[PDB]
């Protein structure tokens, strides 16, 4: 996926790595971030505020001011807590720059109404004479940027960048930046990322289950994703695979329970049953937390498996539903199972034999019942 | 045909030693009818060799090699890799094969490879006229001709899905798993899959999901087409615009999942690298929107697909573009053993039994304790051994003995019979393990077994009553020397350090000593005929051993007469006498010693004559 | 053995025995012509408890029990069984200390000895287990581990040992350092810790193989132990099941010679 | 063994016989997987002939002596000797 | 040295095997395997003779052997 990272995180990345294929004397490493537990002072919480030309006195009586103002952004009602100060650059022109990826290769975007520079994935940008670009205002200052941008892209292209967006730059300078990073390049980047951390969208708080989750994603092939999107949700959801886990998603919205919709995750790529185990037991925790006078619901589907062993992930699922059997049942949970796959009648055996005994509610289907059947027969009913 | 992806005759090589994917494949083939396995060679960067798996219920040979090279050089018939590579090696292996002459079309497995990656390899594939099915994907397969791996599961799902003949239907989802579910739906809508593509779920595929809608508006089999997408990127443009262009003309069904978007956080990405909408554009919605206005089959929700897909095949069959095909033979394969087994569907009876340890569950069990109970509890090795031997929780006294009696006798010089034999192995450039048994071979009754026969002797004289002089004349009569009664240089004035350490100890710490107590009366009677018939380190052990068993009072008579009975003690010292020998074999090995010839004059030669070595 | 008193390594057994140095002194004595320090002695001890025994399934356990089964005595049985300890039972503890000492020695960072053994094709020896992984980890490796952190003097090929671990981890979570891992990198531990042995001693030590002696002296354990668990049981014969071999004779024409 | 007769490399085993090839020949199928020309199973049998003893000297003999001596079984005193067989010894 | 390179000679004579086969054949220790079953024989021969003979147990002579044991000093761990 593509992660966004903090204009402090972007700027210490281009100080540092960008002096390595130009002569970038031009740009120091001068940043400071401020967090809630920690001149130009602007927040850093991924945004589209900003106190311009200002005594570090001055700076002092924003920051107090600002910190944990509650703001609204995109919709979203957050607390304001992350903000960078860097030296207020005096300038005359604004030239904007921005690099992003198309199927064929590298798209430079640069103005002063935009020009667009392609550099192919094969052949690099050394197989690319700059004639492309803009003659009306760059005489002097052609070169230079030509140079620049040559740089930032051998850069983007070295650092593992999905995404970056100088805007804007004077003279050669950076004034706001934008970045997103591949967060697949993770392993390659293990020197250059080595300061930096991905931040939580604007009002999100860190969560210790979600990151206790990607942290067993990261030891394995298969994959195993959390995302909370409403802790005192009724509707849970355990689905197998990316695309079938969108789809019953697309089912509850589609029934009205768009509100009720406790969580979005996914796991596949045959995880073993230590790894679903604590998957289970993490999903059974967040929804044993608070009591719901009509009950909570827990969706174990997903399509049938072209190799995920159902014997073996239902194995880990049933061993942390028998130890959450007493929190299962006084929190009125009621189980709806829809599983396929390698060894699924093992799986749903297991399953069957739980209900019988564990004391709740557990509904189990096969590949007989369409996919997505279990959600308006919990929902509705 | 350039359209053509798979067919009956191609043949693959499997990169990565994927036992379960290969057997599938092969399963596969078999349940087809294919004459040929689609597998020319395994690629194993570990090793090379063979492999064996199952054609049926018959077992087939597969060639393995460590590089992609040395595979293609061997087998150029083989045109498609499945790559099974991790997402730190998809890459490099995708590049090597691609550079190989011979190979076409590369699946990658992988989840979790870079975009710049996956792009690069897009681009190697495109301007070599190749394929790339991938990253983050199952593959996909032709009804009846070839399967990408694990592509479509089970051999029960393949025949429930009636995936062992081609249908009309060409499919291309991002989505694996739900190119499984879509198997399903479509083989219950229509007359099934020709062939279906799964692109996977990542921003940048290798070939994008028109390359594959492209090759199905050539290819004449296929009257059909059905699609699944997803937000996020604008793949699904590319389709759209070739829909508006005229460029499918074959009627398509389209659905883009992802339209609960809208109504959860703006920053929620989805499972699949790719599924996430940027913009408005990137929508399931806009995307579903400008599939109906480009005159798809687009349904209500995903509930619906199968309805469309139902009325998209009647359509066909009304106008005749479909004809009514027979079902051919339904395939059966046998289950396999360990799903059999496993599932509780048969019983199998063990060959072995095994009572003193258990390595099965979560801890390995030594005589039913846990190992970290043993070693927290400082057992020791003696305990150790009195579990594993005994099956007993030894008393201290007696778990020390043990370890007294291994010290004692872990060395007795080079010069007996078993340090003698392992030295001459050790100077002959034997390894330690050979050397090691060259020299406890020769444990048996004359080294090391009088052990074994003084516990044996005393037992029986002190249990059948004999008085200590009764047992002394009766061996005398017989003309048996007693057993660990005697030494060359040691007496009553002089006595053996080693058995006067053994009886110091059982005398200050064993609960009962009365075989001792009885070898002492014996003993006695010994030295009164000649001082050097004291008792021996053997004689010691033998005897003591019985009493520390008469001790732990939970030996009845019988459990010690078998003790004695099956060489316990020829273990015991067998297992402390391996320190020794190991340490004579080293240092042989430290000293650089050459190849031992016992001297010629040590030897007398004595042939037999021409007459007697005549047969009568 | 000549003398008035039998000597262990110069040492008269009375004085071996008096100072209560124990089975691991004595290997010391035997083996290495050391008095090792307490720590070390207990070690060697520990190793042996450890490795006692590991089930009846693992091919030195497999043949004594086979060996018994035949009725052959207890002795013969045991032989039958260590002729298995080699490079694919019981060695990767060599092995391991050999790896691991090389790449810590020639100074090559973690991730550079785990990418260059991926090039080379060769599994780290030491690395890796089958159900065991870093949210389960093997209780043997963690007694022996726990018990180096403690009580050694210095664990410089262990700390190393563990930021190679914390890579293979970071592929697969049971990459994890196995018991043969653990035996032979904090055996080299051990010995750095002594003083007593220069680099070429620890090296020799390795390439003479002591670390196979200590996995088949108290691999014997358990082998003795299989081999009367079977007289008492009274087991039979043992005859491999037929269905459990491929029978593929070569043609006529195959076994031609030219 | 599995069939109705002994095979040797797929050979029967009364064939082997009737045939007479002999130690050498039955060597030839069993390690080397060939039916050996007379020639080649003559001088398996030739080298066996002249490698059965060197005397009771030589590290293997001696080995097997002694524990011989030790009053151990045949076998064990075999191996006993047989395991003196290496890089300097044969 | 002459069982080692005439049965070379024997394989070449064979036809059958290539010279890889013939690699093989060297690297897996066929030719020790040769060796042991021959020896074999008198090996038993030896055994039985003891055994005939009625043979006492063999301990190596004392004066055979130079005992070099290491000093205190030398045993210690610094
Ligand atoms: C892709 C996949 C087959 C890879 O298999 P895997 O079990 O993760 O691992 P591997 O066999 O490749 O081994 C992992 C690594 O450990 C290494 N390793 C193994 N044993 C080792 C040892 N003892 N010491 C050191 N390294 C060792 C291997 O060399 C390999 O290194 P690499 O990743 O750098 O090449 C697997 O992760 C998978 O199935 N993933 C699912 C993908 C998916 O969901 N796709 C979409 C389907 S729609
Ligand atoms: C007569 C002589 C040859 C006897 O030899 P010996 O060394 O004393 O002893 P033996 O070989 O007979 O053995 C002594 C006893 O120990 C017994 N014995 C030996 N090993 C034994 C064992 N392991 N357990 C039990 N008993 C054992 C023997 O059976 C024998 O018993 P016995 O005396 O009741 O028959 C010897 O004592 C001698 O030379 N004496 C000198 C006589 C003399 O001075 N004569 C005048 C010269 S002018
Ligand atoms: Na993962």
Redesign the interface.
Same mark, same amino acid.
């Not at chain 1, 990261?218 to 092939?221: E, Q, V």
């Not at chain 1, 197998?240 to 789809?247: E, K, L, M, T």
């Not at chain 1, 396929?340 to 060894?343: C, D, V």
């Given at each position: 996926?593509?992660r966004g990272i903090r204009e402090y995180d972007a700027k210490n990345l281009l100080a540092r790595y960008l002096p390595e294929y130009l002569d970038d004397f031009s740009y120091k490493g001068n940043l400071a971030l401020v967090g809630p537990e920690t001149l130009v002072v602007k927040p850093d919480q991924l945004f589209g505020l900003v106190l311009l030309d200002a005594d570090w006195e001055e700076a002092k009586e924003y920051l107090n001011e600002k910190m944990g103002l509650e703001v609204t952004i995109?919709g979203?009602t957050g607390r304001l807590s992350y903000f960078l100060i860097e030296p207020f650059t005096p300038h005359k022109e604004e030239y904007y720059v921005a690099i992003s990826?198309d199927?064929? +290769?590298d798209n430079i975007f640069f103005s002063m109404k935009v020009i667009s520079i392609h550099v192919?994935?094969?052949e690099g940008i050394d197989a690319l004479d700059v004639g492309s670009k803009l003659p009306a205002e760059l005489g002097d200052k052609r070169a230079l940027v030509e140079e620049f941008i040559t740089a930032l892209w051998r850069f983007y292209?070295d650092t +593992?960048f999905?995404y970056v967006e100088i805007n804007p730059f004077t003279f050669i300078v950076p004034l706001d930046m934008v970045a997103k990073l591949?967060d697949?390049?993770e392993?390659?980047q293990k020197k250059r990322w080595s300061e930096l951390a991905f931040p939580e969208?604007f009002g999100?708080t860190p969560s210790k289950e979600e990151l206790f989750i990607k942290e067993?994603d990261?030891? *394995?092939?298969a994959?195993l994703?959390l *995302?909370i999107?409403n802790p005192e949700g009724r509707v849970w959801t355990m689905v197998?695979?990316?695309?079938?886990?969108?789809?019953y998603?697309?089912?509850?919205?589609?029934l009205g329970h768009?509100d009720e919709?406790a969580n979005?995750g996914?796991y596949?790529?045959d995880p073993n049953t230590?790894?679903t185990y604590?998957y289970t037991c993490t999903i059974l925790d967040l929804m044993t937390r608070s009591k719901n006078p009509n009950g909570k619901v827990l969706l174990i589907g997903?399509?049938?498996?072209?190799?995920?062993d159902v014997?073996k992930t239902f194995k880990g699922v049933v061993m942390a539903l028998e130890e959450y059997q007493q929190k299962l049942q006084e929190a009125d949970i009621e189980i709806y199972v829809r599983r396929?796959?390698?060894?699924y009648?093992?799986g749903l055996?297991l399953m069957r034999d739980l209900g019988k005994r564990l004391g709740v509610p557990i509904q189990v289907h096969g590949?007989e019942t369409?996919?997505?059947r279990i959600v308006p027969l919990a929902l509705e009913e | 045909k350039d359209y053509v992806l798979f067919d009956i005759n191609t043949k693959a090589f499997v990169y990565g030693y994927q036992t379960?994917?290969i057997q %599938?494949m092969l399963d596969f083939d078999y349940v087809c009818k294919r004459s040929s396995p689609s597998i020319s060679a395994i690629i194993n960067p570990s090793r090379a060799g063979i492999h064996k798996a199952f054609w049926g219920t018959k077992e087939i040979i597969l060639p393995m090699y460590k590089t992609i090279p040395l595979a293609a050089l061997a087998y150029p018939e083989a045109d498609v890799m499945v790559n099974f590579a991790?997402? %730190?090696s998809a890459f490099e292996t995708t590049m090597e094969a691609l550079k190989e002459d011979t190979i076409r079309i590369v699946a990658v497995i992988?989840?979790?490879?870079?975009? %710049?990656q996956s792009?690069?390899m897009?681009?190697?594939a495109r301007?070599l006229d190749k394929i790339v099915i991938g990253p983050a994907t199952?593959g996909g397969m032709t009804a009846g001709a070839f399967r990408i791996?694990?592509?479509?599961?089970?051999i029960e799902?393949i025949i429930?899905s009636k995936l062992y003949r081609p249908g009309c239907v060409g499919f291309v989802?991002?989505?694996?798993?739900?190119?499984?579910?879509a198997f399903?739906i479509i083989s219950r809508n229509s007359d099934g899959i020709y062939e279906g593509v799964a692109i996977g779920?990542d921003?940048?595929p290798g070939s994008?999901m028109l390359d594959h809608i492209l090759r199905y508006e050539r290819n004449p089999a296929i009257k059909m087409i059905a699609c699944?997408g997803?937000?996020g990127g604008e793949d699904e443009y590319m389709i759209i615009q070739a829909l508006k262009e005229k460029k499918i003309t074959k009627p398509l069904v389209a659905w883009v999942?992802?339209?609960?978007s809208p109504?959860?956080?703006?920053?929620?990405?989805?499972?699949?690298?790719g599924?996430?909408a940027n913009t408005e554009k990137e929508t399931?919605q806009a995307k579903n929107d400008a599939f109906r206005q480009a005159g798809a089959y687009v349904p209500r929700?995903?509930?619906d697909y199968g309805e469309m897909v139902r009325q998209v095949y009647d359509m066909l069959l009304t106008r005749g573009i479909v004809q009514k095909f027979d079902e051919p033979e339904v395939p059966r394969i046998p289950t396999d053993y360990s799903?059999a087994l496993?599932?509780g569907d048969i019983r199998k009876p063990t060959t072995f039994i095994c009572t003193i340890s258990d390595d099965s569950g979560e801890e390995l069990l030594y005589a039913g304790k846990k190992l970290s109970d043993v070693l927290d509890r400082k057992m020791g090795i003696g305990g150790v051994i009195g579990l594993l031997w005994f099956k007993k929780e030894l008393p201290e006294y007696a778990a020390h003995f043990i370890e007294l009696v291994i010290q004692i006798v872990a060395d007795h010089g080079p010069a007996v019979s078993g340090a003698h034999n392992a030295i001459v192995a050790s100077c002959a450039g034997k390894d330690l393990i050979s050397s090691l048994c060259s020299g406890l071979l020769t444990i048996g009754p004359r080294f090391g077994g009088a052990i074994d026969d003084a516990a044996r002797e005393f037992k029986r004289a002190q249990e059948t009553g004999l008085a200590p002089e009764q047992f002394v004349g009766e061996m005398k009569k017989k003309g048996i020397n007693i057993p660990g009664i005697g030494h060359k240089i040691k007496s009553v004035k002089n006595p053996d350090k080693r058995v006067q350490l053994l009886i110091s100890y059982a005398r200050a710490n064993f609960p009962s000593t009365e075989l001792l107590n009885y070898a002492l009366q014996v003993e006695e009677l010994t030295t009164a005929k000649k001082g050097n018939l004291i008792l021996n380190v053997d004689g010691c052990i033998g005897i003591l051993f019985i009493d520390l068993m008469s001790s732990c009072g939970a030996f009845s008579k019988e459990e010690i007469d078998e003790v004695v009975r099956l060489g316990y003690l020829n273990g015991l010292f067998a297992l402390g006498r391996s320190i020794g020998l190991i340490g004579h074999i080293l240092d042989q090995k430290r000293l650089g010693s050459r190849l031992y010839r016992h001297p010629a004059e040590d030897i007398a030669y004595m042939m037999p004559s021409e007459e007697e070595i005549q047969c009568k």
């Open positions: 996926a593509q995109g979203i990826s199927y064929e +290769g192919d994935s094969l292209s +593992g999905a591949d697949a390049e392993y390659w969208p999100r067993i990261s030891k *394995t092939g994959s994703k *995302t999107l197998a695979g990316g695309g079938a886990s969108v789809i998603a697309d089912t509850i919205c589609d768009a919709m979005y996914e596949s790529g230590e790894e604590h997903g399509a049938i498996a072209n190799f995920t014997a396929g796959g390698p060894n009648e093992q055996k590949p369409h996919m997505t | 379960n994917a %599938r991790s997402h %730190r992988a989840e979790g490879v870079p975009e %710049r792009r690069v897009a681009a190697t301007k199952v791996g694990n592509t479509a599961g089970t799902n429930a989802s991002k989505s694996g798993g739900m190119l499984n579910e399903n779920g921003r940048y994008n699944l997803e937000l999942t992802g339209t609960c109504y959860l956080p703006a920053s929620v990405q989805f499972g699949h690298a599924a996430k399931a929700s995903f509930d799903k496993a599932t």
